[PDB]
């Protein structure tokens, strides 16, 4: 995408989302990041939406294939699961590479830095979902470390209802439950996050209230599933 203008890449990413062409969307946003400038709030959301949708489809396919493979236990199911897994790992590696070169290091405001570190935790978490080898523990720890740095910044710099702070806590709680084998930590984090947000809702406008309560409902939905 080196020959296309930054503004054109952003415009086409928005069009690709409307057309539900998320692979295109991610390619346009990768091109935009590689222009080397920082991303605005809206542009960070375009980047996240694009890759979250691409990897989300890969994860769903990997889970279908992994279920078939486990029931089976020719080489075809394992080979095809391995092919999907390698493609998923490649996308995660691409996103992590964008964050490392150089989105995180240039992000000084709490909102941007937390957003990118939450993404870093997420993409290591997706790698951890499929990991089995010598590096599985290290992948899990890399997710944990990214989420923890994001949490530390968010608690110092953002109110407890901030939607990025809330989504980070939601995702880190999923990490604890599904990856780290720490369901009590997951439940504690979701509960404390929910309760501290509830007590700050009185400060919010109607539109901010809507955002915060929508994510609080996701925390509650997980708590209902886990308890």
């Amino acid at each position: 995408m080196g020959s296309m203008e930054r503004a054109s890449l952003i415009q086409k990413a928005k069009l690709a989302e409307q057309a539900e062409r998320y692979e295109d969307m991610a390619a346009f946003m990768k091109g935009a990041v590689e222009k080397g400038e920082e991303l605005s709030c809206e542009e960070r959301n375009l980047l996240s939406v694009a890759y979250k949708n691409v990897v989300g489809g890969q994860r769903a396919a990997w889970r279908v294939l992994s279920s078939i493979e486990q029931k089976s236990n020719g080489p075809e199911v394992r080979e095809y699961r391995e092919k999907v897994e390698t493609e998923l790992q490649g996308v995660c590696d691409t996103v992590l590479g964008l964050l490392d070169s150089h989105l995180i290091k240039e992000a000084g405001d709490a909102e941007s830095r937390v957003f990118y570190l939450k993404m870093k935790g997420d993409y290591y978490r997706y790698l951890a979902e499929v990991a089995t080898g010598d590096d599985k523990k290290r992948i899990i720890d890399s997710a944990r470390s990214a989420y923890q740095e994001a949490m530390d910044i968010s608690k110092k710099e953002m109110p407890p209802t901030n939607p990025i702070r809330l989504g980070l806590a939601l995702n880190f709680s999923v990490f604890h439950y599904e990856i780290a084998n720490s369901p009590e930590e997951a439940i504690s984090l979701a509960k404390t996050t929910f309760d501290e947000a509830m007590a700050d809702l009185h400060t919010l406008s109607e539109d901010s209230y809507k955002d915060s309560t929508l994510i609080m409902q996701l925390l509650r939905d997980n708590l209902t599933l886990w308890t």
Binding site: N45, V174, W226
Partner: peptide
């Protein structure tokens, strides 16, 4: 368990 969606929808 659900993680955050890409959009409010």
């Amino acid at each position: 368990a659900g993680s955050i969606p890409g959009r409010r929808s």
